[PDB]
Each structure stands twice: as C-alpha cells, then as structure tokens.
Design a protein around this ligand. Structure first.
Ligand SMILES: CC(C)(COP(=O)(O)OP(=O)(O)OC[C@H]1O[C@@H](n2cnc3c(N)ncnc32)[C@H](O)[C@@H]1OP(=O)(O)O)[C@@H](O)C(=O)NCCC(=O)NCCS
Ligand SMILES: CC(C)(COP(=O)(O)OP(=O)(O)OC[C@H]1O[C@@H](n2cnc3c(N)ncnc32)[C@H](O)[C@@H]1OP(=O)(O)O)[C@@H](O)C(=O)NCCC(=O)NCCS
Ligand SMILES: [Ca+2]
Ligand SMILES: [Ca+2]
Ligand SMILES: [Ca+2]
Ligand SMILES: [Ca+2]
Lengths: 143, 143
C-alpha cells in the first residue's frame, strides 16, 4: 500500500467524467472541510483548474485558479493526496495551471513558511500575503 | 489644487455610466501601465469591484477582486489617485469590496512591506505571498 508511479496518472482541465465520488480525500488537516460535492462546485466556478487522476478515475491531486484573463490570477488551492506526494506531482500541477492561465502579468498565492521552498523552486518570488479567514465558512458557501 | 472632501464622492459596483475617459490617472509608478480602455476591460472581467467617483464622473479610486463565490477571493488592485489619499478612501474601498465578496472563507492579496500596516488596520493578517510577474504583459492581454 506504498509503491506508486506517475506513469498512469492522467491530467484534465474539465469536470467531464468526474463525479463528487471521485473527489474524496482532499482537505487533509482541515477542521471543517468542503465536501466532495462542494469541491466539485469550487472547481466548476474556478477560472481554470487541473486534475490528476488514476486510471479508475479517482482524483488524487488538484489545483485551481481565479483569473480575469487580462492582468491577474491567484491560486487558492493545491493539494496532492499524501500517498502520491514526493513524486513531482504538485510541481507538475503548478506548471500545468500556469499554462492554463497564460502569461498574465500577475499570478499570486498565499502560503505558510514551510512550503516557501516548494514555490521558490518553481520560480516564484516572495512578498507579503495579507489575508482574512472566515472560519465559520470553511466548508464553503452553500449552493 | 489641494482642498478635498469625501462628502461628494459616490461609490458604485458596475460600469454603468463609466467610460474609459473617466478611468484615466491610475497605475501611478507603473512603467508600462494598462490603458484606461484596458482598465475598463479589467473591471468588466473582475468578479466584483468598487469605484469611487467625483460628481463629474471621474473615477478617483478603485478596487477589484477575483472570486469563485464559494471559498476564495483575491484582490489584485487597489488605488486611490494621489490628491485623494489620506482621507480614508482606500480603507473604505476595501471595506466595500469585502461586502461585495461576502463571507467567503479566504480573501487574500499581495503587498510590499510599506503598506502592511494599512492592511493590518483593516484586520488582515500576514503570511507569505508567492508570486510571478510577467513584465512583458504589464499593460494587459489585448482584447
Ligand atoms: C505542497 C504539496 C502540494 C507538494 O506536492 P508534491 O506532489 O509532494 O510536490 P513535489 O513532489 O513537486 O515536491 C515535494 C517537495 O516539496 C516540499 N514540501 C512540500 N510540502 C512541504 C512541507 N509542508 N514542509 C516542507 N517541505 C515541503 C518538499 O521539499 C518535498 O520533497 P520531499 O518529499 O523529498 O520532502 C503537497 O505536499 C501537499 O498537498 N501538501 C498539503 C497541501 C498544501 O500544503 N498545499 C500548498 C497550498 S496550502
Ligand atoms: C494604499 C492606498 C490605496 C491607501 O489609500 P488611502 O485613501 O490613502 O487610504 P487611507 O486614507 O485609508 O489610509 C492611508 C494610510 O495608509 C498608509 N499608507 C498607504 N500607503 C503607504 C505607503 N506606501 N507607505 C507607508 N504608509 C502607507 C498611511 O498610514 C496612510 O496614512 P497617512 O496619509 O496619514 O500617511 C494609497 O496609498 C494608494 O493608492 N497607493 C498606491 C497603490 C497601492 O500601493 N495600493 C496598494 C496595492 S499595491
Ligand atoms: Ca470551467
Ligand atoms: Ca521523492
Ligand atoms: Ca461585472
Ligand atoms: Ca489624512
């Protein structure tokens, strides 16, 4: 329950063929996570996103992005399920979402100190993220 | 060419009655700024935005936001024209755009060290912003 290969991971940028039943297992460590159904809606409302799927259709990594298509984009969420980390998938998802976004002037995201090096190795630079967290709505605004 | 009052500043969240001719004077300090026509398109593509206007219809402050309406939003641009700063307008624009966004779990933005206190006084907290700047496209992706 340990050996892995990225060789039969496939990527897609639509929800065609993806059900909420295939979006379970995310939000590791979140106290009150969006459900898989809510994740599906989050993806549907993103400007762009990238999914990494095993052959059975389970989504084991994703990234989403907000964008105006003209000047700016931001990347709210990036996650690879723990058994699939350390293979380069997170970096690959980031490269793929940047391709989907195009060469916009600004692409920005927030992170904690521990993951700064992950992002620096992708070429991102570091400034201040000012933020709000409305923890009552951590599971998402309902439909 | 110095006295000001916010008393006849009006706010709006649509482009009704706003022309590109009324969106001049922004991007102070930018080497290759979006034109007013491009700014109009940026606003039109935002999830939400707030404009501050004088009685003649000139826009003298704005803020925009990207959002998925479910979990996350980000604020790419905030600017008040220099003769209108130091009256509370920037803070007011921020409060108004947060109202337009609603109580989403995440609201995030990037900034330099100098403006951190402005954002802390609005209740925002500080983390790392990881970012890319594609300076060739500073004036925006064309229509
Ligand atoms: C960050 C994340 C997406 C990286 O995915 P990944 O597929 O392992 O990415 P890569 O294989 O390209 O890079 C992995 C490297 O990133 C670094 N890294 C990732 N998370 C780290 C952390 N929390 N602390 C320290 N280093 C970290 C490590 O150098 C790691 O290499 P290692 O496995 O040899 O230690 C993954 O760790 C994850 O899903 N974490 C939980 C959610 C998260 O923190 N996402 C970031 C936005 S909040
Ligand atoms: C940041 C900005 C929007 C604030 O607008 P404003 O209408 O003056 O906002 P407020 O009146 O609510 O707050 C002003 C206070 O913010 C702080 N502040 C704003 N910019 C600052 C800066 N560059 N360095 C230090 N303090 C700053 C000061 O405390 C200032 O008070 P002061 O005029 O008495 O010195 C305005 O300075 C601006 O348009 N700057 C250029 C664009 C920008 O930096 N926007 C931020 C996103 S990049
Ligand atoms: Ca879509
Ligand atoms: Ca490894
Ligand atoms: Ca609109
Ligand atoms: Ca003042």
């Amino acid at each position: 329950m340990t050996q892995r290969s990225l060789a039969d991971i496939q990527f897609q940028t639509t929800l065609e063929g993806v059900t909420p039943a295939q979006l379970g297992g995310f939000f590791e460590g979140w106290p009150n996570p969006p459900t898989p159904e809510t994740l599906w809606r989050i993806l549907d409302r993103a400007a762009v996103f990238v999914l990494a799927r095993t052959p059975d259709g389970q989504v084991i990594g994703f990234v989403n992005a907000l964008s105006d298509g003209i000047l700016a984009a931001s990347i709210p969420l990036l996650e690879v399920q723990a058994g699939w980390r350390s293979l380069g998938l997170g970096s690959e998802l980031m490269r793929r979402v940047l391709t989907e976004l195009g060469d916009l002037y600004m692409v920005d995201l927030s992170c904690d100190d521990d993951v700064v090096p992950f992002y620096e190795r992708l070429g991102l630079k570091r400034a201040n993220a000012m933020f709000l967290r409305r923890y009552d709505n951590q599971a998402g605004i309902p439909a």
